Design a binder for these strands. Sequence first.
RNA 1: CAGAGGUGAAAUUCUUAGACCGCACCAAGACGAACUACAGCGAAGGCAUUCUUCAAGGAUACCUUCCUCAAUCAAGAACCAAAGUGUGGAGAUCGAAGAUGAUUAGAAACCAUUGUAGUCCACACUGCAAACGAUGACACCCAUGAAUUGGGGAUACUUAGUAUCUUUACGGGAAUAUCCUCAGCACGCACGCGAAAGCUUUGAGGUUACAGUCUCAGGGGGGAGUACGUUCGCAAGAGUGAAACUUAAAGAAAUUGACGGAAUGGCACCACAAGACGUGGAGCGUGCGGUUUAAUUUGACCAACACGG
RNA 2: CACCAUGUU
RNA 3: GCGGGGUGGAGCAGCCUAGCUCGUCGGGCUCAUAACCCGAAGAUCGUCGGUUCAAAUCCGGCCCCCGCAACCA
Lengths: 137, 104, 66, 33, 236
Amino acid sequence: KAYGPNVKKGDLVYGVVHIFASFNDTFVHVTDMSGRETYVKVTGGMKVKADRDESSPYAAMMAAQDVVARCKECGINALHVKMRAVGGVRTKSPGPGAQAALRALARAGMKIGRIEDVTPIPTDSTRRKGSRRGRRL
Amino acid sequence: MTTKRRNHGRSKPAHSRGRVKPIHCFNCGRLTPKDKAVGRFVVRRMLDAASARDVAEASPVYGANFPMPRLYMKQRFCIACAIHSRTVRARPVGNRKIRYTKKV
Amino acid sequence: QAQVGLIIKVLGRTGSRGNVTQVRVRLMAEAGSPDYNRTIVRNVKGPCKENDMLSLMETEREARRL
Amino acid sequence: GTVSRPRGMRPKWHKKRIKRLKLRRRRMRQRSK
Amino acid sequence: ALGKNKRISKGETMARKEWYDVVAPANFEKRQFAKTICNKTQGTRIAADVLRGRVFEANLADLNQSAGEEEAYRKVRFTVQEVQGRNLLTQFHSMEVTTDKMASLLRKWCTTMETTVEVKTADGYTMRLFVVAFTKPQANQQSRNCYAKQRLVKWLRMRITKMIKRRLSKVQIKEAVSLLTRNVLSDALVRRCNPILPLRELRIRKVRVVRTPKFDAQALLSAHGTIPASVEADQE
RNA sequence: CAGAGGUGAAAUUCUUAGACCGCACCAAGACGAACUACAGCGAAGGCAUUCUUCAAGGAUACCUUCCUCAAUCAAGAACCAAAGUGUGGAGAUCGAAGAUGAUUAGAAACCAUUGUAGUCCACACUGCAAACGAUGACACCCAUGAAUUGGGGAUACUUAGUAUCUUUACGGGAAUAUCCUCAGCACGCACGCGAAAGCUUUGAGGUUACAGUCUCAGGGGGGAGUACGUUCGCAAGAGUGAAACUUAAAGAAAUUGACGGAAUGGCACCACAAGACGUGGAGCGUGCGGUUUAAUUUGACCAACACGG
RNA sequence: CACCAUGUU
RNA sequence: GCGGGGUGGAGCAGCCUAGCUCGUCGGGCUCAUAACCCGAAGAUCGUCGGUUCAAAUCCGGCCCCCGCAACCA
Ligand SMILES: [K+]
Ligand SMILES: [K+]
Ligand SMILES: [K+]
Ligand SMILES: [K+]
Ligand SMILES: [K+]
Ligand SMILES: [Mg+2]
Ligand SMILES: [Mg+2]
Ligand SMILES: [Mg+2]
Ligand SMILES: [Mg+2]
Ligand SMILES: [Mg+2]
Ligand SMILES: [Mg+2]
Ligand SMILES: [Mg+2]
Ligand SMILES: [Mg+2]
Ligand SMILES: [Mg+2]
Ligand SMILES: [Mg+2]
Ligand SMILES: [Mg+2]
Ligand SMILES: [Mg+2]
Ligand SMILES: [Mg+2]
Ligand SMILES: [Mg+2]
Ligand SMILES: [Mg+2]
Ligand SMILES: [Mg+2]
Ligand SMILES: [Mg+2]
Ligand SMILES: [Mg+2]
Ligand SMILES: [Mg+2]
Ligand SMILES: [Mg+2]
Ligand SMILES: [Mg+2]
Ligand SMILES: [Mg+2]
Ligand SMILES: [Mg+2]
Ligand SMILES: [Mg+2]
Ligand SMILES: [Mg+2]
Ligand SMILES: [Mg+2]
Ligand SMILES: [Mg+2]
Ligand SMILES: [Mg+2]
Ligand SMILES: [Mg+2]
Ligand SMILES: [Mg+2]
Ligand SMILES: [Mg+2]
Ligand SMILES: [Mg+2]
Ligand SMILES: [Mg+2]
Ligand SMILES: [Mg+2]
Ligand SMILES: [Mg+2]
Ligand SMILES: [Mg+2]
Ligand SMILES: [Mg+2]
Ligand SMILES: [Mg+2]
Ligand SMILES: [Mg+2]
Ligand SMILES: [Mg+2]
């Protein structure tokens, strides 16, 4: 398939994987180092049929394995990691599929570069959803 | 009724200040005064021990010398949310006055 | 298609009703293989014990600690 | 529970009833004077 | 979820792409960092038109092979200024400490002092610098906190502003980038500010270019020295 | 490039007319995270980015000045979160009302997607809050240990110690260590006090051994902060404020039980799990109830019903 | 963190 | 005068040869009621005729109820 950069066999060609793991879905998005070009984007909802399971670790692992397949056709063999939670005024805790997706990429044979946490952190914020009494569940 | 806490459950003495601006609870978003909310600063590893060792094998940068990044986040809870998540539990009347000044 | 694993430590009875046992299993693979001496945590249904053997099918999912 | 036994409805909603009743009586005397 | 979409219209991508090389200015050890793909020129859409202005982010430790353990927590951004064949000639865009390292410097019984400095370089670059400093207890101190007096905080902020303005306004953007990458400016800041207030750590958290001069091809060429060749256009 | 969103699970909703996601930007309005503390400032309400500004305010220092000028208060005056009102702006976020989707026996509630007034600013009103320390103001006495904020001083005995770090310009500096001191918010804790919970130089102590000074309010529970009158307010309302009548308690703090869709630790095949064999469907025996009858004698309703042997 | 309403003096 | 409607105990479909829901009954679940679970019964299609092999259905007459008209002087 080739479709890759003119480099020596075995050389590390680096992409950036953006892992957005909320509590409803997991995103496995592979771009370049500028972020402008996207080689591939597979989500957990692309892998399951029930809404309740799109955020499951198994769905994230399945989506990560799909990404490694396509990355090989692109020529990308190494990835810098940028993981994020919902952020903003919402929760900053990463979703269940964040750890599963990263582990799946490592086991699938793709080299892991630098890892960073890039959830949007406001230095001050608008009002969060819900009343002053919070979500009454 | 009877006064449960001399503190009244917050950190605002009678002549220290009038109003402390509220914060949104970490879980449910309830507005609670910042001196009253249960505040925990947690340092969390990005991956567990099994997952960290797998990612380290495939990482030319991370290994025995370079530690992997951690998660730093100050969490402030509503009283109800802190009790439900078990970060704080009801205590016997005698033990209610026990205070901790550092993470243990 | 099914990898054989050996139970090396019983961690306890997990879940409600105590019908599931969490164990640490070492994958029995030939030397030089990537899965050599790989230990994973799994959930087991049925009476199990140390030094028992399991057919794991897939060996990627790790059970949550409890 | 944070207060003692009320012996009646919630006093805040009892206050709202009285306020609504006071308003209605005020308008009724307007259309007779 | 799969097979759930109802309204779809409301009524080989790789084949087109061509690989390019991103080149950092000559003041960095690893000149040809990163590699990107752009649509091949087709029609009136010239590839270099959409390639100009892209911002690439790389770790400083990867750019400069110096294992000081401090460069591994700094990201450097570059803006594509000119496309020369298959090489993207870049200019410094911004520098920022990684989120994990910045969040780990906070302590709960000390004063966090922040300074924002806007400086104009000699070649017409406007840079906004963000400096964060932390107070520390003394060696024999027994107090429960080391909060700083507001008078000393304002003095520290003013001295930082003066030193950064004086040091960076008389240099070019290339020299200013070197001053920031090798921590020569940071070393002098913490040396001249510690007598004001005992400082646990003084760090330039973020540097951003906010205004650029008009483009100059000769200026870009002199900042890149000997441009390494690119083999992407070369037949495999 | 085929989903995204959202939930306990969903749906309303968005999406090949390209949603979501990714990178660098632009606009607009809010907000000032971490640092943020039984910390500071303010009469209270309140107050958190930086720089430049304008009037203040407190503490401390003083062998400066002065000479009862004070304390507390009807009347009177000013200020006062949020919501609300008027007129102009602004309108990102959130969001009373409303809409739609769920959940439900019902649900116009809680949950989901939205959305008006609002939320923000200027000017003018309103004067209500668990406006709380449910604790009026001024003054006196008052035991102990560890701290903290600001300013100073030192390095029945005739006088009793001590350091560390940085250091080319808001710099004869800054922060620390030890000791003392005045003022401020407080913590663990001696008398004494209290119905108790608790309070304690921060009194709720120094009170039947009842007197430092001034002032506000209360007199069983309801009716009711209602009616009437009146003042103020654009309105919403606010202040003032009864009676007839009704009632034996209402209420306070603690104790022991019981209970909790609160938590912790255990336990049981009259519990479950893994299972077995059945019962519930058929015929029939028997007990119980109904119905019937002259009478169908009667007890018993997990712990009654092949039980009263 | 689905749904659990009531009990003649 | 014109148009339209009568259907299980109630409310409505099918009206161009019997259905739903509520109710009722039996059994479960509960200490018990409700909610919930499993089953069952209940229908001259308003009456009188006609057409047709066969009429709730198609064609007339009859009894209630329902609307729209009932104007110019
Ligand atoms: K989901
Ligand atoms: K697009
Ligand atoms: K009011
Ligand atoms: K028994
Ligand atoms: K009840
Ligand atoms: Mg979804
Ligand atoms: Mg709850
Ligand atoms: Mg104060
Ligand atoms: Mg207040
Ligand atoms: Mg608290
Ligand atoms: Mg209670
Ligand atoms: Mg109570
Ligand atoms: Mg009371
Ligand atoms: Mg009442
Ligand atoms: Mg201090
Ligand atoms: Mg800040
Ligand atoms: Mg307001
Ligand atoms: Mg307006
Ligand atoms: Mg219900
Ligand atoms: Mg109703
Ligand atoms: Mg509804
Ligand atoms: Mg409904
Ligand atoms: Mg609604
Ligand atoms: Mg409606
Ligand atoms: Mg009041
Ligand atoms: Mg209070
Ligand atoms: Mg007070
Ligand atoms: Mg009061
Ligand atoms: Mg008071
Ligand atoms: Mg102070
Ligand atoms: Mg002092
Ligand atoms: Mg007396
Ligand atoms: Mg009375
Ligand atoms: Mg008024
Ligand atoms: Mg008037
Ligand atoms: Mg009005
Ligand atoms: Mg009006
Ligand atoms: Mg025991
Ligand atoms: Mg069984
Ligand atoms: Mg049977
Ligand atoms: Mg039977
Ligand atoms: Mg029988
Ligand atoms: Mg028993
Ligand atoms: Mg028996
Ligand atoms: Mg009832």
